[PDB]
């Protein structure tokens, strides 16, 4: 039960990392595209 | 008990991903700022 709560909290952490990774990927791609267009 | 140990190991993995994401975000921002300043 505390074990399940752990896993739920871990799942929130994971969704936070997913958010982060997607933000970074968009930003790196924007920079690659800027360099290409220059 | 092995279940708890699993979750603990998973938690170490997650903290490693957090470290990674924060390193990347600082580095991408430094590049965006460099391009802006040029």
């Amino acid at each position: 039960n505390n074990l399940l709560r752990a896993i739920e909290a871990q799942q929130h952490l994971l969704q936070l990392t997913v958010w982060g990774i997607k933000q970074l990927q968009a930003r790196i791609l924007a920079v690659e595209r800027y360099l290409k267009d220059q | 008990n092995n279940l708890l140990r699993a979750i603990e190991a998973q938690q170490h993995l997650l903290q490693l991903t957090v470290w990674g994401i924060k390193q990347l975000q600082a580095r991408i921002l430094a590049v965006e700022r460099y391009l802006k300043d040029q």
């Binding site: 909290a9 952490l13 958010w19 | 708890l4 938690q11």
Partner: peptide, 22 residues
């Protein structure tokens, strides 16, 4: 990202206390 930093710390602390109670 300041809000992210804080949600990370919050769920990390919550997880570590739950692992302890287990």
């Amino acid at each position: 990202w300041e809000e992210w930093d804080k949600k990370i710390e919050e769920y990390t602390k919550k997880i570590e206390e739950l692992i302890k109670k287990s």
